[PDB]
Amino acid sequence: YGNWFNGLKPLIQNSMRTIMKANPALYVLRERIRKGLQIYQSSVQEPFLNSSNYAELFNNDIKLFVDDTNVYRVTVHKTFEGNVATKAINGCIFTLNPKTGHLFLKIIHTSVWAGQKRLSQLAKWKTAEEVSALVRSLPKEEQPKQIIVTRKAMLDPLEVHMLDFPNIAIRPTELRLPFSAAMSIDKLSDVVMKATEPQMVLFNIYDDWLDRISSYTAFSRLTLLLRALKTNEESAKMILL
Amino acid sequence: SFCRNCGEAGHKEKDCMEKPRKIELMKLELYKDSVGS
Amino acid sequence: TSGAITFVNETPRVIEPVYTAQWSATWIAMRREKRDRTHFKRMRFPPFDDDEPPLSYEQHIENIEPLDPINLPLDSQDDEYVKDWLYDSRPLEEDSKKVNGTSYKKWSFDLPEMSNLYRLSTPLRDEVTDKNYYYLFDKKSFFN
Amino acid sequence: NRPERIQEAIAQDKTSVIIDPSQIGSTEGKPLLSMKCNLYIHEILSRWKASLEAYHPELFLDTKKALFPLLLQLRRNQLAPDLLISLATVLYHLQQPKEINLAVQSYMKLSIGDERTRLWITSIKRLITFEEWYTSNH
Numbered sequence: 001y002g003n004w005f006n007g008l009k010p011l012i013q014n015s016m017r018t019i020m021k022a023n024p025a026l027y028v029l030r031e032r033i034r035k036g037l038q039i040y041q042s043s044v045q046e047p048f049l050n051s052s053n054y055a056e057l058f059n060n061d062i063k064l065f066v067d068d069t070n071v072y073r074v075t076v077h078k079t080f081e082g083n084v085a086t087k088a089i090n091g092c093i094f095t096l097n098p099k100t101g102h103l104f105l106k107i108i109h110t111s112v113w114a115g116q117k118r119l120s121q122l123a124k125w126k127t128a129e130e131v132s133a134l135v136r137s138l139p140k141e142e143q144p145k146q147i148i149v150t151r152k153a154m155l156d157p158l159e160v161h162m163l164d165f166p167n168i169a170i171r172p173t174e175l176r177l178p179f180s181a182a183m184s185i186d187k188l189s190d191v192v193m194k195a196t197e198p199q200m201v202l203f204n205i206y207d208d209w210l211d212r213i214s215s216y217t218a219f220s221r222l223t224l225l226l227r228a229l230k231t232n233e234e235s236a237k238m239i240l241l
Numbered sequence: 242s243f244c245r246n247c248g249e250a251g252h253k254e255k256d257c258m259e260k261p262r263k264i265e266l267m268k269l270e271l272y273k274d275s276v277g278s
Numbered sequence: 279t280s281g282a283i284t285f286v287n288e289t290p291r292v293i294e295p296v297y298t299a300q301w302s303a304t305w306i307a308m309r310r311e312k313r314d315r316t317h318f319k320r321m322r323f324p325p326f327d328d329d330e331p332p333l334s335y336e337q338h339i340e341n342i343e344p345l346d347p348i349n350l351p352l353d354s355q356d357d358e359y360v361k362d363w364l365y366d367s368r369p370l371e372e373d374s375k376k377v378n379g380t381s382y383k384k385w386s387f388d389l390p391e392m393s394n395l396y397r398l399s400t401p402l403r404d405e406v407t408d409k410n411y412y413y414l415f416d417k418k419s420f421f422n
Numbered sequence: 423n424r425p426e427r428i429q430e431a432i433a434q435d436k437t438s439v440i441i442d443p444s445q446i447g448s449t450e451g452k453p454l455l456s457m458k459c460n461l462y463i464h465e466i467l468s469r470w471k472a473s474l475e476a477y478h479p480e481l482f483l484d485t486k487k488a489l490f491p492l493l494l495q496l497r498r499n500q501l502a503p504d505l506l507i508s509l510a511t512v513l514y515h516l517q518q519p520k521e522i523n524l525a526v527q528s529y530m531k532l533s534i535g536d537e538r539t540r541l542w543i544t545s546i547k548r549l550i551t552f553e554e555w556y557t558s559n560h
């Protein structure tokens with residue numbers, strides 16, 4: 001209630017709608033009220049991804065991977081007083097369709113953090129906000145039936161942001177897939193490094209291999225390369241190049 | 242019945258508030274289909 | 279003289295037909311104000327914060343001129359016998375023939391004054407002159 | 423009189439879709455960009471009609487319905503500048519063979535940075551995917 005000028009009232013409407021839907025402190029309140037009241041909501045829990053069932057990734061249900069590991073990043077230096085300290089650097093969200101090789105790479109710029117406290121929480125919530133906006137940009141036939149998150153800490157923030165989409169399961173995995181090593185890919189590293197503002201850059205990470213090999217084979221190749229890059233980056237690059 | 246103190250109807254003397262006193266739809270549709278959204 | 283306690287050492291004596299007329303004027307004024315005032319802003323309670331001491335009267339309060347009280351506007355003609363004095367703290371307390379003296383214990387009015395006070399008292403005065411009204415609704419029937 | 427006006431309108435519509443970078447960058451290009459984008463989207467939808475049973479036929483009808491208000495808003499030059507310029511650069515990328523990847527990246531600029539707006543925007547994404555499917559098949 002109060003004195004509106006032109007354009008303010010629609011903005012505050014949209015602002016309050018999203019804030020009430022998905023603010024993290026109001027989520028803590030709701031979860032505590034649920035725990036104190038001992039109320040639980042029924043659902044059909046989708047199974048985990050593992051090495052016994054991951055062949056299912058390449059059937060006709062559209063799927064997307066999500067990795068948050070590179071959303072918050074830092075570099076380290078030693079201060080004048082003898083202490084050691086961090087400084088934030090540009091980051092990203094890795095979102096990959098494993099059948100087609102389409103990578104959606106949302107760049108998370110250093111201006112997003114605004115010097116705030118408790119940034120490692122804010123990163124997980126920002127990740128869910130960008131993933132759910134990305135899903136909303138796609139038409140119904142191209143929206144996935146399942147989304148797989150590499151780190152379980154994403155499951156609550158993403159489920160909250162995805163309540164708009166009742167048909168879409170969010171899945172955990174037993175495989176510690178190496179997708180954090182995407183920032184060891186030279187071109188992606190450069191693209192994230194040079195950015196002066198938030199933007200999303202789109203690629204195919206399978207580089208037309210699908211003309212001569214299957215999606216299963218292409219995923220195996222991608223995971224093998226990224227595993228080596230995570231294992232020993234210098235040696236892996238020095239094999240590839 | 243009216244309030245004799247002020248002349249207004251309804252309320253009594255004791256209940257008075259005054260003090261006591263002594264069609265471009267068709268153009269764009271015809272490229273494709275029938276009218277009607 | 280130690281400052282331990284202060285008693286108010288006086289009795290609020292009032293003249294009953296005057297007190298009834300004063301409160302009736304107050305009643306009419308408050309009714310009119312509730313009607314006319316578009317938004318009546320009520321006070322908040324407690325009026326002062328728990329951690330703030332009570333105000334020094336001489337520093338903060340004594341120098342401020344008070345605001346207007348609730349006084350109903352009386353007619354210069356049709357209230358002439360009471361307009362000069364109705365809102366005093368002790369009405370007629372200096373008028374040696376209307377009141378016994380400044381001890382304020384006995385009063386004696388004329389017919390024009392008593393008529394004016396009766397006329398002002400219309401909200402808060404009784405108007406049941408008929409003694410048969412209280413048939414089986416009186417003290418002794420309640421006792422029975 | 424209205425059918426005759428329709429006749430001269432379709433007579434103008436057949437004469438081309440190729441967009442120019444300088445006209446994207448120009449305020450005076452508002453009518454030209456609007457009309458050219460309208461015609462190019464009509465050409466995409468026509469080639470979907472030519473290939474209807476091969477590629478998601480149940481969705482083409484709803485796509486035509488959803489793209490109705492965009493095409494009307496273009497036809498009356500009523501798009502806001504940011505929407506028109508972002509759509510024009512999306513369609514500019516879409517006209518080249520190799521630049522399909524950048525068209526969908528520019529669609530992200532369009533769509534991310536009401537209900538009717540959301541419908542026609544996601545329908546533009548549908549057009550992009552039809553273009554990708556066809557060009558990969560041809």
Ligand SMILES: [Zn+2]
Pocket residue numbers: 244245246247248249252253254256257258259
């Ligand atoms: Zn009245």
